[PDB]
Design a protein around this ligand. Structure first.
Ligand SMILES: [Ca+2]
Ligand SMILES: [Cl-]
Length: 533
């Protein structure tokens, strides 16, 4: 004869559940719930927030849905026909996660001797070929065909040492301070990630409009996790049963007004709030009404895959302060995570902090299929054929105090199937000079590895404007650029890039053959898509 404890008895009664209808098993589970109110790891993406983000995606609301793109206008990047870091030979690469060289305080795209500079991950489709390359164009030149490739930052290499995403800013002497993810795969092919930095010096040949990589100096590891705030590789190795994610990547540089420099990055929580079975019993993780939470608790416990995922989910967006050695930084201070998703997701990527007015806006990309709630993310695939989102938060202070935008944190939601030419990912907001209430959203378009078809390569998306409202909401605007436009300037707007949800329109969001084509095995691609209203 098991008896409910005091606090949980109140919850059960408030929820309209008849206490005498509970089994001993259910009672014993309920008595394990921890009703602590103290947040251990920053602002959380809760189980309820995740459900709300999925529901908002399914609704395909004009406020949040990624705009439709004119599929017929999308081209592979001409500058991606280039020497491949892993072969030394010219091949047709694809390009995905990319970032501009930008001012550390304002985020504005830097003007380097009349050029704009972008660093991006590129490689041959369906090869494990993860390295970073420098791309350049005249500053304010919106023509996608004009970008040129200066080649791989670190020259030729192999899959043993990889470079994944980060950020970059100029030094006073005109070198680039690059923050990137160094990945070592020598230990049973694990992706052992570390935050690294290097100083990159460029040579300009003016009469050829040609930029080359001249010197790479000070290449070293900045941060690998501390174990308390952020999970280390050794901790991950010790707990893994084969289904735990590892993250220490995507460092985004930002300076405060006093010129202290920080990196904001993707990681997992350490022993401050570690993953595990115990997370299922932390009421704070649920984030709905007491009644909603009670229902969620039983959903998790009764479904083995959701329960498994819940035990391993502990994504975090972290922040560290660097010391003042700009070209050769070390860590000065490690903070608690800004955002975390214990019990909820094991992957939140590409964090991006932008200062607008006197507030800090933090955005991140995520694939909802990395979340614990299989029913929620499976519903997004059924509605749209994809499960990607951008989430966002706002704070008065850089290092703490973030509040979710649009209530749940939702900012952008997938609008087309993952295997269409116009699918996007890796959203990255860039500020716009002279428009302090808007951001330009850049992304890559077409998923990697020929999922949209042979010859359909990941490439730079048309960019679009996002309106930021002072009441902690956002709205997608009907303003769109050429592919690969990182700078919103007087000639950026190109309405021809806009797509429509119509099978045979010349500006259809679908290429011929895509409307109705299977996705996720037998789902009809596009079947449940609706005009954005
Ligand atoms: Ca985990
Ligand atoms: Cl490297």
């Amino acid at each position: 004869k098991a008896e409910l404890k005091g606090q949980v008895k109140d919850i059960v009664e408030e929820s309209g559940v008849d206490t005498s209808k509970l089994t001993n098993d259910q009672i014993n589970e309920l008595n394990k719930i921890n009703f602590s109110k103290e947040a251990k790891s920053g602002t959380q993406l809760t189980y309820n927030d995740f459900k709300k983000i999925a529901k908002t995606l399914i609704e395909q609301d004009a406020r949040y849905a990624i705009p439709f793109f004119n599929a017929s206008k999308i081209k592979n990047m001409p500058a991606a026909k280039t020497l491949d870091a892993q072969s030394g030979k010219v091949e047709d690469l694809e390009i995905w996660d990319s970032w501009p060289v930008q001012d550390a305080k304002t985020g504005y795209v830097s003007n380097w001797n009349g050029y704009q500079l972008v660093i991006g991950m590129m490689g041959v489709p369906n090869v494990n070929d993860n390295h970073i390359y420098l791309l350049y164009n005249k500053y304010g030149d919106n023509d996608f065909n004009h970008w040129k490739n200066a080649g791989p930052i670190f020259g030729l290499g192999t899959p043993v040492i990889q470079q994944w995403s980060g950020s970059a800013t100029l030094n006073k002497d005109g070198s680039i301070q690059l923050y990137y993810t160094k990945v070592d795969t020598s230990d049973n092919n694990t992706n052992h990630q570390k935050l690294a930095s290097a100083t990159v010096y460029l040579n300009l040949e003016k009469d050829q409009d040609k930029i080359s990589i001249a010197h790479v100096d000070n290449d070293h590891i900045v941060f690998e996790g501390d174990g308390y705030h952020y999970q280390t590789y050794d901790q991950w190795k010790e707990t893994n049963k084969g289904a735990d994610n590892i993250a220490m990547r995507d460092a985004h540089v930002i300076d405060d007004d006093n010129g202290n420099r920080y990196l904001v990055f993707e990681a997992s929580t350490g022993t401050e709030n570690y993953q595990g079975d115990d997370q299922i019993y932390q009421w704070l993780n649920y984030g709905g009404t007491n009644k909603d939470n009670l229902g969620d608790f039983f959903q998790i416990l009764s479904n083995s895959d959701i329960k498994d995922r819940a035990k391993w989910s502990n994504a975090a967006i972290g922040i560290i302060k660097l010391n003042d050695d700009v070209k050769n930084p070390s860590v000065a201070k490690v903070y608690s995570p800004l955002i975390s998703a214990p019990m909820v997701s094991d992957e939140i990527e590409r964090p991006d902090v932008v200062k607008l007015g006197n507030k800090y806006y933090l955005f991140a990309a995520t694939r909802l299929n990395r979340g614990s709630n299989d029913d929620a993310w499976m519903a997004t695939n059924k509605a749209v054929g994809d499960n990607v989102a951008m989430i966002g938060y706002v704070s008065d202070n850089l290092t703490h105090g973030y509040v979710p935008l649009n209530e749940s944190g939702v900012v952008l939601t997938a609008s087309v199937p993952a295997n269409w030419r116009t699918a996007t990912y890796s959203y990255y907001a860039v500020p716009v000079e002279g428009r302090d209430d808007q951001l330009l959203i850049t992304s890559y378009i077409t998923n990697r590895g020929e999922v949209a078809g042979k010859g359909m390569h990941a490439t730079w998306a048309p960019s679009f404007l996002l309106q930021i409202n002072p009441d902690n909401t956002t709205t997608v605007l009907a303003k769109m650029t050429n592919q690969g436009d990182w700078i919103w300037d007087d000639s950026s707007e190109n309405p021809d890039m806009m797509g429509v949800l119509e099978k045979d329109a010349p500006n259809s969001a679908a290429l011929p053959g895509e409307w109705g084509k299977p996705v996720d095995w037998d789902l009809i691609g596009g079947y449940n898509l609706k005009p954005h209203q």
